[PDB]
Amino acid sequence: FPNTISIGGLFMRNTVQEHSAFRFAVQLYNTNQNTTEKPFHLNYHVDHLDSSNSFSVTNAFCSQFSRGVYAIFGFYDQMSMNTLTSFCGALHTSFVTPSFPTDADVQFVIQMRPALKGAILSLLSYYKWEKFVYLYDTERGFSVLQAIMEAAVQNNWQVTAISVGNIKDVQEFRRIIEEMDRRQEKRYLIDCEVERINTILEQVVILGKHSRGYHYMLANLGFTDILLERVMHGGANITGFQIVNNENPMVQQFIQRWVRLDEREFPEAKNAPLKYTSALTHDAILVIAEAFRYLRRQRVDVSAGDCLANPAVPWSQGIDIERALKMVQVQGMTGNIQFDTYGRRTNYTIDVYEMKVSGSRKAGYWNEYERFVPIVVTTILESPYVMYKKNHEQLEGNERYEGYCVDLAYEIAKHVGIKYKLSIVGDGKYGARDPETKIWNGMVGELVYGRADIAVAPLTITLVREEVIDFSKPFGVATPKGSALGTPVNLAVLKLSEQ
Amino acid sequence: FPNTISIGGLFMRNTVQEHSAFRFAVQLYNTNQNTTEKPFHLNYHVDHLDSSNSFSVTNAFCSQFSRGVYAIFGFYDQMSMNTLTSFCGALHTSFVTPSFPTDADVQFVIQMRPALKGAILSLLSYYKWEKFVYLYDTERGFSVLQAIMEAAVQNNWQVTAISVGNIKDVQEFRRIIEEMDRRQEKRYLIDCEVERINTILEQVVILGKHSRGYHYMLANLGFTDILLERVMHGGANITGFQIVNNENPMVQQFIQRWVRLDEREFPEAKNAPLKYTSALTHDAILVIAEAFRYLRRQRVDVSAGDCLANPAVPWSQGIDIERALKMVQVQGMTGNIQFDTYGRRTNYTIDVYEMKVSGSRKAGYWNEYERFVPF
């Protein structure tokens, strides 16, 4: 058994802190005094990628492989995911990565980041969400998207998915929020990188739509690194996830010894919050060190060329190494550590945080077995149907309207048992179709496109409209297609007529 | 100047007609009699690859480079364009391909597929489209998606973009069509591969949404391969684009000699319609041959190392090779062939077809300077 173990390192851009944790964690292992806990020295070879062109990524990997390493620890993103994953599998070299888990199962890579699809789905059922907006990108895989859309069919939800992956101008973000606001959408499910989430919820506050009613779910680990001071002032609910618990004694010891380090040797150490990826980076050394300690106990023999060789014959000890790495069980900084056959984390735990005006609070945990143990009415102005009261300037609310229709709306609401907020269509027309643009206008246009629920007004009944919206019997009021207020209002007017 | 010129091939799966067309075009050039038009012999080292991996793709490319080639002609999909494009640009080896044009500006890549951004935008403004449903997938870059979104903000459109690139169960397609119809959406703009377009148009006819009133604009240069006979009879409106014109004397001559070929040595000949990608493959051999003849006439020095080397030393003469290939002006099947500084074609002649009950009808043509001119 070699007296020293060499492992590779591949760090992409904007990962300076993770580099410090990688260096710090290795130092802690080396400085240990007990012979049993430190049976061999540990070395490492760092390298920086570009993640833009596969020539740089391929060259960097071959430099590491040719030099001679046992395992490789590094990050990858969408562009360079395929190059590193494919090379590692063919050459029989493990790859301990804290990056997002791969969508398709693959061998010889162990991804130590818990998935969220299970946690998200349970919370959606817990809050009983039926319709909402879903903003997403493709910087972390399609796994979450393919589960939300698949679950919508089985539960008959009304998800409205939007892809904001390629948006580069804040105008698109503003229009998306405004357009979905017109449809009375109060629930959003933001699943994007940290930078995008900051931009998205910076637009909501400028638009001033962080009031009491709206609820936001931030499906992204790293709930600490999201600016939330401004949004929470309005009172809008917010929900996030975390895996690093500050009350665990292990994190407290690491954090206590992590802030006293010299700045020059370990940049961005003391005056910066600790990203969860730093916690995963520290854990990786525990997993790799533990795996090699086991390999030493069993007296398993272990001991390079160039990547592109025909035929590509891999060194036979690779299978043993990954088996050891996929069997360890260590109580790490992020909780229990256990890997299944394909290398994904299992028996993990996510802590959900429901943060309020006073501050963040822990609202429960999501174990893998115990899952999450804790009307606007449109109308047009036409006397005597709807008219302004004697003094509409002083009055506020729907108390400034007086006429025939407002009386009818009150009677219908009382029968059904709802609350109505009278609104005036700004177009000023009953409704018609433009022959060239095929765009409805007026009351029917608003009613069809989901901007209203019922429409009490002198809306003449005709064949053209009846094909688009469901009227009631003549008195007729209108409702969207498939709305649940169709039958109750139809009977309400019929019984009113009989009296 | 060498007595013979050797190039390479890189064909992925679902590519048989193009492979036979690539062989036929080379044979056509080699068998010519006029010594002025056939100064040098041409050869190829065709090789197949699997894009699903990135270890076999680079392994196949490095074998081509080590063998020694002057230019490489091959295809690439979304998940393997980075490896091919990046290696070529770093080792100074041109790459003539008929596949989809790249989103970014990259050198040492010559693309023979005309873009569709201009044609779609002009048609949308000509038909007064201000409320449509944009179904799309990302198998051919995001170039079209950005153009539509940027145009919508400027022109104040209302686009409901839905990504259908990751749908395997047809029930999802049914829900999308049913819901969008509930909002009174009559105009669609389907931008997907040929296989997916067939699936979508299959669900439309089953649902009975193919009657008069609905307008479908198939944004793909494959109008001669979409199975839409059923929708034709329904009465809906269909619009499509094409680049290959059957009245061109060159097209007619090639097809006359195309169907007479052997059915075993040249598979997919005399059996299936000539996919437009086969036309681009024939034009690629026109461009490669013409560019190298020009170099021989001008008395330029052209005349292999390891695939990967820490000192990246490119060819000294590879700038000349890819400079000549971008000056060509050779009339071919797809109209005028002429490249700009980035390897993207210029002076297109995109052709618009509108289909009626009688049959497909020439509705007009779109040009970069004259935009859309109907007749």
Author numbering:
A (entry chain C): 2 to 304, 309 to 379, 397 to 497, 737 to 760
B (entry chain B): 2 to 304, 309 to 380
Copied sentences from the primary study:
GluA3, a subtype strongly associated with disease, functions as both a fast-transmitting Ca2+-permeable AMPAR at sensory synapses, and as a Ca2+-impermeable receptor at cortical synapses. The GluA3 extracellular domain tiers (N-terminal domain (NTD) and ligand-binding domain (LBD)) are closely coupled throughout gating states, creating interfaces that impact signalling and contain human disease-associated mutations.
Rupture of the Arg163 stack not only alters the structure and dynamics of the GluA3 extracellular region, but also increases receptor trafficking and the expression of GluA3 heteromers at the synapse.
